[PDB]
């Protein structure tokens, strides 16, 4: 479902007679998603459990 | 009909037995409250007149109706304070009050400007008494020689300017006759003519300058925060300047483009302090500058826009205000300091309360509807018109409107009370009753304020 | 009070050190690394180094000063509930319970009294017992326990003896 | 506001003549917290306390407006050039934006069309 | 010293004696007085009142004007050429000079 | 009725061409909920129409004419003016509310067009700017709170103006 | 969860055994860690910053100092968590 709503919106943007350092500022945040969804799943939960209780 | 019955409630309290007093002090104003709202509501295609000008009637008067609410709203929160005073005293003060509102219901309904005026001076003297006498703070005087000092200084200036006008054109009394007016020719002679009208409406209509009136007679409480709603009513008492920019002097306001300007430094100034001062009474009281000052901004631009948010506001402040000074009023009878950083705590020992502090904060700011919004934005939309860089100035009153009523709730939401051994029961029935009979009349005019600002609306 | 401004110092250090790190091995790997660097010198005893040492062990700790530190559980002030999910109702509102509404829950309310009036009974000798441990004027900074405690009841008791709880 | 690095750690003197002067503060915080503790601990109180610091504290704002402020310096000037100033400055704004106006209504014609407004 | 002046006075009863009450002094008169007549006039002149603030007193043509302006819509359109406004109170007055 | 614009004539007709599946599931509704609760409330409807029988007539608006203008009525006179005061107040409130109606055709030809609103119309915009214009230039909207006497100075000034214009051109 | 006083005395104790520091039998319940347990100085803060991780990390530095014996820092942990009724 990223696809129908995010990927439309790039597509679109880059036929335009707007900025392109505007357009390029944001082509580096479309890459950006990747790492903060990763600081989710690699670090709080992927690898060794680091909960810290008795129980 | 509104001619004998307030005079009728004077021997009332003499005659009743010592048991009583109260009981039958509030219960014969409330049905002369049902009869105000019942009879004066009424309006053909311009303004009436109920008799000859003994008193006259209504033109954009809605806020009769409001001190006749306000008949018996002084009553209910004086219940705790003079309990334990002498019961011939007791008789002494609802009269001077009765007296208060006598005056108030002939101001607003007599249409003239001498008549008008002395009877607007006859509320000075029973407000000196009730401010100098009960007065539960030390340097009391100094509030009540003030009061008299900024007010008469301004106000005797009108003596030698409404009997010059009728000296040279016809008669000012009946009002609707005076559309005689000449256009004023912009003379230097024509400069103090202006100043000495204006200057009376603007002490109890408070400025930026001359605005020291308001906060002593707030802070040197007259009765801890009950007597607090006559100052209240005296603020919207400078209803004369929505009569004498109208009729008096139309053609020449490049006099009034100054006056904006000093009050409109009474919108941004004046909420600034209101900010860090510890009384909790004084952050209502430079609030209540900067709310009244939008009445100041907008009569002088004479614009019709200006006409509906100042009549609103009128109304919108005489509820709203007085309603947070009955909040004050809760918390000095149990504290008996009214310092806003000893004073912390809700919903611990008063949860019920909690609720009736939003629905009175949060109505300083523009919430859905009530009367403020409709109140405002009108002004706003009328101070465009006048110059676009307003909203520039206006914008930042809108922000600190946010930091009145927010700043009022988070140091009171803040949940301690350590020190506090007091405040054990929550609040009695009559307590709740003020937070109710000040609200849902708010509350009621959400849905049709038609009959609420209303100079030909 | 040297010997406590070296405790605080090492206490502030290891709390630190978790918000750099990542997994639990690497945090036991660097705190014997400071064990290293703070053991060696304590043993030896200095007048004027020791002092030297501290005022450059703000070095390195404000070099590395704010990755948001990681004050993760209910801990005073900082982050994540200091003092919350905290309705706390003190024993001022307990005394003003209306009637025909008090009566539900009797054991509270016949317990409650019996509390009341071992308060009531014990002040006078409290006073006595605080009133007499005095240096001279006002005290030296500190609480004053029972000394000759026979019967019981510390002098100052209801707010530190009676708390919420969380 | 702070210039350096947050001063905590930094600049304090190694347990010389300060020591004697740190011990004299818990001398005086402790006496007026037993006078405090004393006047807490009963339960026939029932009333908040006075505490003479946060009434002091209020008498400090509220009143002190002309016993103070009798040597009228210049700094009292350079505050009301902060008072007056503000003042005197819109004219030169709002005086401007309508001398613009005005002009257009009169010559080449700025009004609006559906303008029913005022 | 003033010998004549120190006698304070401290009492906040609110619950303490009466139970339940709004106000000190005879708990009979309290609950006629707090409970009863406060609340009357809680109800006549806010819910029979609110039935003439705004719920039909006529008020100023409001009502009135919207029958008067929609026949005269159809009237001056259909028979007259100007759209209800042209000139404002003055045809063919005195002239200034 | 009458005074409304309206449209001329509403289309629409159901097609079901493409497709069977479950019909149109809409209709099927449409159906289903006119016995539901709208045939429960037009029954109920017509049980108050018919517990009404007598009804009040009300004469509804009143008349009250000309009067005689205060452009004729020369001199300060407090017995004249007085109903010539009236008079302009009351054709106030009534071309307040002539605008209101061209308002809402302006509002009714956003909604019935749609997609063109611009394009199309044509007619509700002219006559937008037909009465505004007029009401601009006449009736206040430069002359502050309402007064007769006002009204008559700024209707002098539209005069002394435009007979300045004409005679030099 | 809740917490109860012979729970206190199991958590605190499985905490100080896993430590490897001191010995099983050196140190059973009273015995002080200041001088009876045989720790330093470094070692006090290291073993109250391990207890607080396991039960629940609210331990000042004001209050580490008055820290020293095991039952007074299980009783000190009850104290400010409001354990066993």
């Known amino acids: 479902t990223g696809f129908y709503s995010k990927d439309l919106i790039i597509e679109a943007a880059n036929t335009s007679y707007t900025n392109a350092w505007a357009l390029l500022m944001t082509l580096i945040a479309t890459s950006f998603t990747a790492i903060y969804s990763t600081r989710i799943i690699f670090f709080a939960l992927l690898g060794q459990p680091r909960f810290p209780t008795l129980v | 009909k509104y001619i004998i019955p307030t005079i009728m409630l004077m021997p009332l309290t003499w005659l009743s037995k010592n048991n009583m007093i109260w009981v039958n002090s509030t219960a014969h104003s409330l049905l002369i409250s049902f009869t105000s709202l019942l009879l004066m509501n009424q309006f053909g295609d311009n303004s009436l007149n109920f008799s000859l000008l003994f008193f006259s009637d209504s033109l954009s008067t809605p806020l009769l109706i409001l001190t ?56 000075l003297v029973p407000t000196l008494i009730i401010i100098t006498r009960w007065g ?50 912009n003379s230097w002679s024509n400069v103090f003519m202006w100043l000495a009208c204006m200057m009376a409406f603007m002490v109890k209509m408070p400025l930026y300058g001359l605005h020291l009136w308001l906060p002593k007679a707030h802070v040197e409480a007259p009765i801890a925060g009950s007597m607090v709603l006559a100052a209240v009513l005296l603020k919207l008492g400078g209803y004369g300047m929505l009569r004498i920019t109208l009729i008096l002097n ?30 909790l009474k004084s952050l209502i009281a430079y609030s209540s500058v900067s709310h009244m000052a939008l009445v100041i901004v907008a009569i002088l631009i004479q614009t019709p826009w200006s006409y509906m948010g100042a ?19 809760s918390n000095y009878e149990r504290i008996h300091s009214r310092t806003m950083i000893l004073a912390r705590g809700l919903q611990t020992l008063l949860p019920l309360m909690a609720t009736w502090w939003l629905l009175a904060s949060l109505t300083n700011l523009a919430l859905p509807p009530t009367i403020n919004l409709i109140g405002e934005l009108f002004v706003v939309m009328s101070t465009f018109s006048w110059s676009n860089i307003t909203i520039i100035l206006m914008g930042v009153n809108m922000v600190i409107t946010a930091l009145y009523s927010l700043y009022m709730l988070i140091m009171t939401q803040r949940g301690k009370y350590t020190y506090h051994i007091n405040n054990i029961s929550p609040s009695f029935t009559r307590e709740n009753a003020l937070m109710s009979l000040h609200i849902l009349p708010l509350l009621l005019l959400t849905l049709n304020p038609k009959i609420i600002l209303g100079p030909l609306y | 009070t040297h010997q406590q401004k070296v405790l605080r110092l090492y206490k502030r250090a290891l709390r630190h050190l978790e918000s750099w790190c990542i997994h639990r091995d690497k945090y036991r790997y660097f705190a014997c690394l400071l064990r290293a660097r703070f053991d060696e010198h304590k043993n030896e005893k200095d007048m004027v180094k020791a002092t030297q040492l501290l005022r450059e062990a703000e070095e390195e700790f404000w070099h590395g000063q704010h990755p948001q530190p990681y004050i993760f559980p209910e801990s005073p002030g900082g982050t994540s509930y200091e003092r919350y999910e905290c309705y706390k109702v003190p024993e001022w509102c307990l005394d003003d319970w209306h009637p025909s509404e008090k009566a539900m829950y009797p054991d509270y309310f016949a317990k409650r009294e019996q509390w009341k009036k071992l308060r009531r009974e014990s002040w006078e000798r409290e006073v006595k017992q605080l009133q007499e441990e005095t240096p001279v004027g006002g005290p030296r900074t500190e609480a004053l326990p029972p000394a000759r405690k026979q019967g019981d009841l510390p002098p100052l008791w209801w707010h530190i003896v009676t708390r919420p709880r969380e | 506001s702070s210039l350096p690095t947050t001063l905590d750690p930094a600049e304090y003197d190694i347990s010389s003549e300060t020591r004697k002067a740190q011990a004299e503060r818990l001398a005086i915080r402790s006496r007026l917290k037993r006078e405090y503790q004393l006047q807490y601990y009963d339960p026939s109180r029932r009333g908040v306390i006075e505490d003479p610091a946060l009434v002091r504290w209020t008498y400090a704002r509220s009143a002190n407006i002309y016993p103070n402020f009798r040597p009228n310096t210049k700094t009292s000037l350079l505050g009301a050039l902060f008072g007056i100033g503000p003042l005197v400055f819109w004219y030169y704004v709002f005086k401007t934006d309508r001398d613009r106006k005005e002009k257009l209504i009169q010559e080449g014609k700025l009004d609006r069309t559906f303008n029913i407004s005022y | 010293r003033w010998q004549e002046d120190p006698e304070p006075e401290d009492e906040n009863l609110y619950e303490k004696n009466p139970d339940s009450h709004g106000y000190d002094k005879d708990p009979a008169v309290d609950i006629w007085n707090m409970r009863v007549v406060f609340f009357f006039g809680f109800s006549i002149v806010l819910v029979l009142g609110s039935t003439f603030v705004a719920y039909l007193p006529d008020y100023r043509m409001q009502e009135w004007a919207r029958r008067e302006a929609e026949r005269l819509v159809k009237y001056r359109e259909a028979h007259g050429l100007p759209i209800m406004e042209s000139n404002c109170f003055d045809p063919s007055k005195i002239q200034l000079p | 009725x009458x005074x409304x614009x309206x449209x001329x004539x509403x289309x629409x007709x159901x097609x079901x061409x493409x497709x069977x599946x479950x019909x149109x599931x809409x209709x099927x509704x449409x159906x289903x909920x006119x016995x539901x609760x709208x045939x429960x409330x037009x029954x109920x409807x017509x049980x108050x129409x018919x517990x009404x029988x007598x009804x009040x007539x009300x004469x509804x608006x009143x008349x009250x004419x000309x009067x005689x203008x205060x452009x004729x009525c020369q001199e300060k006179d407090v017995l004249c003016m007085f109903e010539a005061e009236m008079q302009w107040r009351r054709d106030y409130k009534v071309d307040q509310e002539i605008v209101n109606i061209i308002q809402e055709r302006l509002k009714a030809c956003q909604q019935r067009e749609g997609e063109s609103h611009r394009q199309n119309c044509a007619k509700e915009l002219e006559q937008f700017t037909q009465v505004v214009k007029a009401y601009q230039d006449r009736y206040x909207x430069x002359x502050x709170x309402x007064x007769x006497x006002x009204x008559x100075x700024x209707x002098x000034x539209x005069x002394x103006x435009x007979x300045x214009x004409x005679x030099x051109x | 969860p809740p917490l109860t006083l012979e729970g206190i005395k199991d958590r605190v104790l499985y905490v100080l055994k896993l430590y490897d520091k001191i010995d099983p039998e050196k140190l059973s319940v009273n015995s002080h860690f200041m001088k009876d347990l045989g720790l330093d100085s470094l070692d006090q803060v290291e073993i109250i910053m391990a207890m607080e991780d396991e039960f629940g990390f609210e331990i000042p530095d004001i209050d580490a100092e008055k820290l020293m014996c095991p039952q007074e820092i299980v009783d000190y942990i009850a104290d400010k968590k409001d354990v066993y009724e």
């Open chain 2, 136 to 185: 539960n703070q030390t340097e009391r005087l100094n509030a009540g020689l003030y009061f008299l000092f900024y007010t008469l200084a301004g106000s005797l200036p009108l003596l030698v300017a409404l009997i010059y006008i009728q000296n040279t054109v016809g008669s000012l009394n009946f009002l609707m006759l005076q559309y005689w007016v000449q256009p004023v020719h």
């Open chain 2, 311 to 329: 009549t609103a506001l009128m109304i919108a402040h005489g509820l709203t205000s007085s309603m947070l000074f009955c909040l004050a009023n």
């Open chain 2, 68 to 123: 006749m609410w306000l008949l018996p709203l002084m009553l209910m929160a004086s219940q705790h304070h003079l309990s334990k005073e002498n019961l011939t005293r007791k008789k002494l003060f609802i009269t001077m009050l009765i007296s208060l509102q006598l005056f108030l219901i002939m101001t607003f309904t007599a249409m003239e400007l001498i008549l008008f005026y002395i009877l607007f001076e006859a509320t």
């Open chain 2, 250 to 279: 139309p053609m020449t306001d490049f006099m009034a483009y100054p006056f904006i300007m000093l009050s409109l430094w009474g919108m941004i100034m004046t909420s600034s302090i209101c900010l860090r001062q510890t009384d």
